[PDB]
Structure 1
Amino acid sequence: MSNEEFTQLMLEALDGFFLAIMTDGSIIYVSESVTSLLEHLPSDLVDQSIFNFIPEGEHSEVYKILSTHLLESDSLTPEYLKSKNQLEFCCHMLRGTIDPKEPSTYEYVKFIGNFKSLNDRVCFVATVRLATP
């Protein structure tokens, strides 16, 4: 069993995909299953902001809850960061469209992730799954 096969099965069982953002929400990575869960290609997401896909009324609380969580690191110097434990939150994400005449549709999803320094930058690596409220 390959690395890629294992993550296929785990993310299938979760109904989820992998996502990595910078602290301003800029998207640097998305795994292939976002297509069957949201009908975006990963390349439509990478280099865009996560907030381009979150309804505006949610932005304040998502950023607040991420910021507040990052403050739990004792220092913010990237070499010495390490998330103490996982962050959890839910929100909507816009779906892709074959028909732009159609009105916009959204999936309610749950994030689970951690801050982690790259390479030094601070990024949030997460699993995003379908959820219900």
Structure 2
Amino acid sequence: KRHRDRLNAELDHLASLLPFPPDIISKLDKLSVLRLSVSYLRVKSFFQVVQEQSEGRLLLESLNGFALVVSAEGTIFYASATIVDYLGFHQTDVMHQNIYDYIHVDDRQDFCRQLHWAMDPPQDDAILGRLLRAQEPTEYSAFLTRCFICRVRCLLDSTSGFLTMQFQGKLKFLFGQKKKAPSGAMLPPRLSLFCIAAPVL
């Protein structure tokens, strides 16, 4: 009714506050407006917690590859704008999506393995406590480096439709995500892969 109009007006509000040019915003539907809104708040919450614990553009352009952050559950918490130069997917297509949808089926299991602290994903909170308490390069930093090759869905490839990429980075705690238990208590932050994704030539 008029309520459906009230809901849609707030979605329009949200869309107009998204940090992208009007030509990108106008192409988004209501579902992406929400996805990207959530995406934006999650990233700002992370940096707020990092701020509490106390170029750039040229460095981004210098890399042969794009910056990528994947959460413990395989969510694309951040992808830099240059992702489009490698895969044809825009930053807005990818943000807060499931990483496994963009990974070749036969590599998905490996990629999942790379996200786990011991490369042993279940098919645990106590040891992450030590890793968390160790921070604020800790004792455990040598166990959390990651360098692997994976096939990534690529709209710029006309053969397999996949680009073979090397993912190089570290597992770091993704703060400020405000996950909560059934009881209501705030869950501790989980490890996410902070990496550069570069094509193997």
Query: TM-score band (shorter)?
Result: 0.7 to 0.9
**Which has the larger strand fraction?**
1
User: What is the CA deviation profile of residues 63-107 of structure 1, one whole-angstrom value per residue up to 9, with x for unaligned ones?
Assistant: 12332xx128x921273365613211110111237xxxx776111
1:34 CA drift (Å): 0.4
Identity of aligned residues (%): 20
Q: For residue 15 of structure 1, give the secondary structure of its aligned residue in structure 2.
A: coil
Give the aligned partner of residue 113 of structure 1. Answer: 169
1:62 CA drift (Å): 1.8
From the CA coordinates, give the structure whose radius of gyration is larger. 2
User: What is the CA deviation profile of residues 14-58 of structure 1, one whole-angstrom value per residue up to 9, with x for unaligned ones?
Assistant: 321111111121111111110111111111111211110001111
In structure 2, stretches of 5+ residues that fail to align are: 1-54, 120-125, 177-187
How many aligned residue pairs are there? 120
Q: Match of 1:80, as an amino acid?
A: R
Q: Does 1:79 align with 2:132?
A: yes
Give the aligned partner of residue 104 of structure 2. Answer: 55
TM-score normalised to structure 2 length? 0.52
**Which has the larger helix fraction?**
2
TM-score normalised to structure 1 length? 0.75
Higher relative contact order (CA 8 A, sep 6+): 1
Change (3 A) 1:40 1:71: same
Partners of 1:36 and 1:61 in 2: how far apart?
A: 25
Give the aligned partner of residue 198 of structure 2. Answer: 129
Partners of 2:134 and 2:160 in 1: how far apart?
A: 38
Q: Match of 1:121, as an amino acid?
A: P
Give the aligned partner of residue 20 of structure 1. Answer: 69
Q: Does 1:92 align with 2:137?
A: no
1:116 CA drift (Å): 1.4
Partners of 1:104 and 1:42 in 2: how far apart?
A: 22
